[PDB]
Design a protein around this ligand. Structure first.
Ligand code: CA
Ligand code: CA
Ligand code: CA
Ligand code: CA
Lengths: 474, 474, 474, 474
């Protein structure tokens, strides 16, 4: 275990209070790590600001080359990154290695290429006797805050576009899951000029707040809870900082009577429980048309019941633990509240596992109504609810009657219906006859309380630049 | 004399407390207008939300047709609009009619065309066996808050793109200058379906806050002060609303030894004093190279001294009054502070005019240093300061060491220097050998405390949509 | 009727040989019109070339305003234009007036808007110390050759984008259908500066050849037959002229077993026979899956048999005559060849109408095989053929094994199949569960022998510009 | 060494007549290579056509990865490639290695990135009840013909975008310079699926004609002479093939009285003579303002006279020989033609060098007039001409009065002038205060007889796709 911070091209020990990092599969401490002191937070931001003078002036080609080298370093170290993430998060090692690592490497390669492909408006004389042109310049110092559910992947989503755009970055991983970020710190120390990338460690109150509130920080990019989002916005209000957030989701899964039910089941067994449901696009809120409602519930219940939980290093393990005791307790609470409703039935699961670590049984709840908390509020655990609906107009309005707006799916064999519904859903992404698939070229980002700004795609790159108009009188 | 609110396709009287509207050229009350009550603010947002169901689904062609009709109505009523704005704001009538009206009409015509020209990423299979496409959908209800310096123009800048994008709008003009917006309410009542456009009137605390804080409002667009900007961001944090903000400027005007001094003088006499300097891009902060400094100051001083102030309806009037008694006092205070500095010389002006109305003399201050308040803080009055500089590296770093980032100009005959400086200035716009020129197709917007988001251009339209990814498994 | 040419802002009589223009509904001559002489063709190109000096430098705003004026003039003369087109082409007057006129007006309004929204690459430093920008400038003089099937529409498709881009145009309508273009000449004479738009009249050999071969012509835009396309390309080879070509089609209409047969029938009754099948996107080549084949043929046969042929000015007329005696002869030949095959059955029609004019009976042929001439070669008449198919892979390969590539449709209720087929069809346009719908913002243009270049959309505008890279060392 | 063709994933000997390849520095034969037989040309195209079925459906990510691997292979083999090109073309080894190789590797890396960043129009409902989307699909089989001046680089410019777009390619290098392409064939054999890339060898008439005329070829990309361009266009007319053409240049270099003369001289000494002037962007046609005309001529004459000719493998060699005996004679004829004029002076050079190889002395001609052949016709040798001019309007009109339109440069210190002239030049590229600089992200391509279509940049990638509109009724 690497445990040093990266500040201005050097690896240094944190000077703040030591913090424990746990293995959620066993509930044991992996190690205690000193967090950044206030002076180190300040030194990180100042180093990034000083490095911006030269970095912000580099060509896209040069930045692309640094991104390609970083992608190669992560690829070369894929096994070690997968092992660390598996130990820190409890993710099944085969999933971390086969799914996450290649996606992370690709994000950096994609953005290396995108850095050189920025669009604009044609230059020309829009006012007689004056030539106008449009540029896209970097902002300056970006503070990035990564969540604990996909520590390395989210670090990549924030680092890649920011750097590609020519900004310098100060990254703060979640205090719960810093291991892969600190390994990255070690490996990436010499790829970019000193201060262009800085990596800190610590809690929101002791490290995150001084970071996001620093006068030299121009943009704050956050993936986390709505509460944390609200706090950051209020905390940066005084300096009008640009913000980029992704705050959570409660993806509606709309299943019509003509859907391939076997495919929906096979799909949700994966998409509602992958990463133990700790995914902002988890297929957690199912709306099933009255005609297939009971068949779907019965078949899905049987499929969810076979999900195998066990050691993350076991190839047969499909379901890992929740990230912490606190999160385990919150998931349990949401389930009990759904049960106290009187009209929700536990089809399978609905209880914590006996034993060490923070495992919760794969759970399916049926009979949930539109206005119930289990349908209106994110749980972020291995829990899926099913609600019956009558018709298309009704279900689209129910799905759109939500505070969330990140992702959604519609399941139907009818061409007309698939396009009608996709056109009307107020969600950043809509999959048809699938769910959960992301690619580096297509944007991912929400609407409403899910936030704003995109991760991945050229739009993700654009978010980290400012458009400028230069007009020459001639 | 129009004084009614536009709510859900009907013209109704405000039900709140009456508020006086002044003629800044005489200091006399033009009339008292009842502001919107709390219930009316709520009714406007609810009508916009209800109208969005259909409006948000219209084609670009249909929206473009509405925008062209509005442009024609404004053009046909050009003289009336120019008279109202001159009476309410004190702008010379000839300027309001010859400069503002055509620009306003053009904003609507431009966005009518832009509504039909939105870019995206090519649709295709980025993941084997899945077709992806990118759409740009509207957000919903937009709350727009217009400032008092260019009431009708800023109303146009907020209405046009929001509507072109398919959103419904609730607009609140400044309590100081509602006349043109209320005339627009009368004229535009039947062009869009009921509830698509709503226009209210009232103070920030009484009407603005209830409006921007409404749960169904998805985006808030503001042009105003930095202080107002911080207040709105804090106010909307709880619901993660999207914001779009232009908050003020202090445009650096960089004059090198090889500039055409006669052109700089003729330029600044207009750009530093137009609209009495109440313009976020006013040429107010001059950095002049030591070689030409004394020559520039003496010639500028003599040119500024001939600016003619008088009745706004007189064709010879070049300089109108400031917007209010309060603003006149603030401007006066900033000048007195500059003078108490001990090292700033008043070349001309520096006093309020005797007589009725809120007139302040066209003022030129010389010897101001980089760290003086007159250089670091927006005055927003008929006041220009000049600071000497030694070299290119020094002055670009000075200019960039600002909390502002809206607009700027550089004056030099050298091709190399013009491009070098333009490339490095941290301002949304940089003019070369001119200043102050805007066109509908080129974006206008800031960086840093000046805010974010663009007015005008296709980027201005894009700011009012959300990018969505639809992916079909096939 | 107007019969004068528009050359350099003047209306002048042709100085060449007189040529007859026929009313295809009666076979009688509407009038004799003198064609442009050699010297007039040359004078038109020289006028366009001289006008380009100033026109090529105008702003988009100015050009947009001229296009809006032209749209207004056509709109105000809608009835007259519809009547001329109906008399010259035999199109049912109600169709010309209700369908064509509004689309024509829209093309001009669309391009007025698009002229101001041209994209490019972001300006910036791609090579250290050098600022690059991308412009889109006009080419110069464009020669446009319009076909006889939609004379005014096609004239608009060529004029609007070329002018919007800043080029000067010399337009030559078909010798068969010049009436609407010569009326346009009259009405549009004063909208653009002298020489910016020129309209000639005459045959391909006497007027078209000297026009397209003029050394000052930079681009030739043609809608016509493959043979004509080949001739023009060979004729312009020596000067490397840019070409833009739409040469014919044979839209495959692929109907799967799960399609809505009643919708297919109702659809094809219109799409296969509108404008008497003289439409490059006519639904003329049906591939019908073996399950629904017999049902489709019988129902389509009955539906096609009720199409009403009669006087163009009678509201109940649905089918007009073919455009010329010669085209009537060619259509009859192709049907007789299909019949001599021995395996093709005439379900309905298959003969010329007795009486005056060039009417051909609405015709449906069944049992056509992939390799038959009726499936492989364009007929451009009121004739539709049906070919049975077994499976998806087979039919997509059949449809793609064609020299044509303009448009296509697929009819199926299955989401997956609709996207799979749409993705693989080698045709510029693919409609799903409809056919024949065009809008000003979406491009229309082919592949393979159908040609290249787009009409309508922003792409249609880009085709009339040249991208330029300006790079300033600094 | 390598002399085999690449056909359908296999390296095979040509079956046609043996052809000699010369070392232009010594005039000796390097070797005899069997060219492709007619059957081999047909097998190459059929292989490409069959590979397209699968290749044309790959994802951009997959194609990008193949391009990155090819870039890596070229980079690793940089020295070998540089040595072959130097031996085959006579280019100074140090220039081929330090300039060409890194640029070639970057073309492939740039397009790997650009393959994943294609733009389109937003998908949505442009017609009520119908969802439209825009795709960019590949064409099919692309025939590429590379010239002899930059064999490998031109091969890369043709291969990279075509492959990135999803097409299969059949490449033919010039008969005089096949060595690098055949080495590439060996190295690239296993990077793409069989038949996706094919490389042939032979003469224009025996190999190039059967290739560009093949019915399955959909696009022909040529860099070569105007005569070859005209022939190809005529040759492919019968099948309406798409063409992409770069046919030669005669770059005007406009030098105003306020230019930095020493920079002009140092620049042209390089740009007028690099690659022995066998460059379509060579700085060969200088227009010098009357004020500095004589000074420029004298200084340039002295600088050009020191250019060192010698063995290509000698690091001190600056100027290599011309490509062939026939090209050397053509260059010598053009010079003699200029001298027979009676008003052109030879400042330096103007004769073939004594000895073996195809060396011609670096030449500067003065007093050339606008209408002289030396000014109007490309020489493509180490020859530069200088013509005096009076004013800006005159010289812009002279420069624009040319059959060429590829590249240009303007030299002046004045901001206004630089932009005015750049705005008006009818050339694909204009450099300001430099010349000859290309980057992978910015397009290179001509207008008029220089051709059309772009190399490099996203536009170069777009040229190899067809835009498609898919519209779903719903
Ligand atoms: Ca969601
Ligand atoms: Ca500013
Ligand atoms: Ca077709
Ligand atoms: Ca050229």
């Amino acid at each position: 275990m690497q445990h040093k911070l990266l500040i201005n091209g050097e690896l240094v020990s944190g000077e703040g209070e030591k913090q424990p990092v746990y293995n959620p599969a066993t509930g044991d401490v992996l190690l205690e790590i000193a967090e950044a002191s206030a002076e180190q937070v300040d030194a990180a931001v100042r180093a990034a600001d000083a490095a911006f003078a030269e970095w912000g002036q580099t060509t896209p080609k040069v930045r692309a080359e640094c991104l390609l080298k970083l992608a190669d370093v992560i690829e070369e170290n894929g096994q070690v990154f997968a092992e660390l993430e598996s130990r820190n998060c409890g993710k099944p090692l085969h999933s971390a290695f086969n799914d996450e690592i290649p996606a992370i490497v690709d994000v950096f390669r994609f953005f290396a290429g995108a850095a050189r492909c920025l669009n604009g408006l044609a230059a020309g004389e829009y006012l007689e006797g004056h030539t106008s042109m449009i540029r896209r310049d970097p902002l300056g110092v970006v503070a990035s805050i990564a969540p604990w559910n996909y520590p390395l992947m989210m670090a990549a989503w924030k680092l890649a576009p920011a750097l590609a755009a020519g900004n310098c970055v100060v990254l703060k991983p979640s205090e719960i899951t810093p291991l892969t970020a600190l390994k990255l710190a070690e490996l990436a120390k010499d790829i970019f000029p000193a201060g262009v990338v800085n990596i800190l460690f610590g809690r929101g109150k002791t490290v995150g707040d001084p970071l996001t509130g620093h006068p030299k920080v121009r943009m704050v990019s956050l993936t986390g809870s709505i509460a944390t989002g609200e706090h950051i916005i209020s905390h940066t209000a005084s300096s009008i900082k640009r913000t980029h957030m992704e705050l959570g989701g409660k993806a509606p899964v709309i299943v019509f009577d003509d859907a391939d039910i076997e495919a929906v089941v096979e799909g949700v067994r994966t998409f509602g429980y992958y990463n133990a449901g700790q995914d902002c696009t988890a297929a957690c809120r199912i709306y099933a048309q009255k005609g297939i409602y009971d068949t779907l519930v019965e078949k899905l219940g049987a499929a969810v019941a076979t999900l195998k939980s066990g050691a993350p290093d076991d190839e047969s393990t499909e379901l890992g633990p929740l990230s912490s005791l606190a999160h385990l307790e919150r998931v349990g609470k949401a389930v009990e509240e759904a049960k106290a409703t009187g009209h929700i039935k536990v089809i399978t699961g609905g209880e914590k596992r006996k034993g060490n670590g923070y495992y919760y049984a794969p759970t399916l709840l049926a009979g949930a109504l539109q206005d119930d908390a289990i349908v209106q509020k994110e749980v972020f655990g291995p829990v899926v609810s099913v609600t019956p609906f009558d018709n298309e107009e009704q279900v689209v309005n129910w799905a759109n009657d939500s505070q969330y707006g990140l992702a959604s799916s519609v399941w139907t064999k009818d061409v007309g219906r698939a396009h009608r519904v996709s056109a009307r859903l107020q969600y950043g992404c809509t999959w048809v006859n699938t769910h959960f698939m992301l690619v580096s070229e297509m944007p991912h980002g929400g609407q409403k309380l899910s936030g704003y700004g995109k991760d991945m795609s050229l739009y993700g790159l654009e978010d980290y630049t400012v458009v400028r108009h230069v007009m020459v009188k001639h």
